[PDB]
Amino acid sequence: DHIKVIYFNGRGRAESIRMTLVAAGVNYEDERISFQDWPKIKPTIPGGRLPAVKITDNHGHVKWMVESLAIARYMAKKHHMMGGTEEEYYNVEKLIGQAEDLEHEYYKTLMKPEEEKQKIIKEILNGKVPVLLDIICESLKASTGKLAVGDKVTLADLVLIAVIDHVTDLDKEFLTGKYPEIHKHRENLLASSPRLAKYLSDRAATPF
Amino acid sequence: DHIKVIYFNGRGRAESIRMTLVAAGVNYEDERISFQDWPKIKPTIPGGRLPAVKITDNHGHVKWMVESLAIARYMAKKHHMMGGTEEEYYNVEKLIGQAEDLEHEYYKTLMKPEEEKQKIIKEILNGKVPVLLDIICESLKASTGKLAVGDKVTLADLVLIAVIDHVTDLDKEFLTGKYPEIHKHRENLLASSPRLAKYLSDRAATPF
Ligand SMILES: CCCCCCSC[C@H](NC(=O)CC[C@H]([NH3+])C(=O)O)C(=O)NCC(=O)O
Ligand SMILES: CCCCCCSC[C@H](NC(=O)CC[C@H]([NH3+])C(=O)O)C(=O)NCC(=O)O
Known part of the structure; x- marks a missing residue:
């Protein structure tokens, strides 16, 4: 195909x-x-x-x-990549939901003039963003494996790293020294998936 | 349980x-x-x-x-209620994704000074809301059955009617004389599900 x-x-x-x-x-x-x-x-x-x-x-x-x-x-x-059990399926979806919440915080800053883009950035980084990042960290901690859910790659792994990239777009150092589960997740995911690691190496910076 | x-x-x-x-x-x-x-x-x-x-x-x-x-x-x-095939699953998820887009347009009106609220309402009802309602109508049109996906109830049916209720909260007459697929959907849904019809009758009025 x-x-x-x-x-x-x-x-x-x-x-x-x-x-x-x-x-x-x-x-x-x-x-x-x-x-x-x-x-x-x-x-x-x-x-x-x-x-x-x-x-x-x-x-x-x-x-x-x-x-x-x-x-x-x-x-x-x-x-x-959506779970091996109903329980794994729920956890995949739980993390996609939490990551999408974060994505929608990031969306508030878009299509806005420099001025108020910065006011909104400050608002979300002082409010809902850290709240959601901790919640994500708790989801990750509860995993039985190296990755988001178990030891094999799921859609939750992929959704999470893309939205973290949007968060770092707002503030490069927001996760520096913090959220150890999210850092450890990205490294385990890249280790488990040479294909993804190469893909990420080969793109190709974009603003959004 | x-x-x-x-x-x-x-x-x-x-x-x-x-x-x-x-x-x-x-x-x-x-x-x-x-x-x-x-x-x-x-x-x-x-x-x-x-x-x-x-x-x-x-x-x-x-x-x-x-x-x-x-x-x-x-x-x-x-x-x-998530589809009987991978294709139905996709279509269930397509409708959930579209309905959730609409929900997030509605979310922009919330926690906002009372007018403020009204300028946002006017922005979205002239903008993304009708765009998404039509897109939802196209999704409904493509169903092989009387409901969102086939003939039996799925999560897409339920997600759709909840979000439409939020749209009518913003403007009660927004779908009046329009979006025939959405009206017909709600009608077919309540006919297929006496339990849901009963539940929506006995549900106390809520502002959100
Ligand atoms: C980081 C940016 C992300 C912002 C979301 C916008 S993607 C561009 C936009 N499409 C959508 O909003 C589709 C959203 C839908 N929920 C999806 O994920 O497919 C579009 O075609 N717009 C062009 C048009 O409407 O004509
Ligand atoms: C109709 C508008 C309501 C929709 C969003 C608000 S739900 C209330 C809020 N929780 C959430 O935002 C959870 C959102 C999450 N994405 C989910 O769907 O479960 C909360 O517990 N907040 C209380 C708190 O943080 O202390």
């Missing part, structure tokens, strides 16, 4: 999908649409938003997929 | 859990904490946030669960 992931030139909502396929060892075309080209591409995209995933089989079937974490969950499930 | 759902006196994040259990025919204790009582209750809750679900079996085991849609997804999966 040809898998084409369509997004803007950034991590954003597409990163969960990219990382899932990378971790699973699945090849895909990573298509990045410039903001200038978006107006003409927009009508060709079912639903008119990105991420969109276009899957073509070798018998001409074209499957369109939207909603990033729905796609990632689908792909993760196909490749046994 | 005894299931106690702990939340504030409101729909909010607990409603997905309540509806899941109600739809599945699972009995639970619905515990509502006053805002005044919260400071003494808070330290007794693992992670110090609501909703939290405390489960006690007949052999003294206490299982604590946090993160509402992780909990809902867990219960939904136990009771075959």
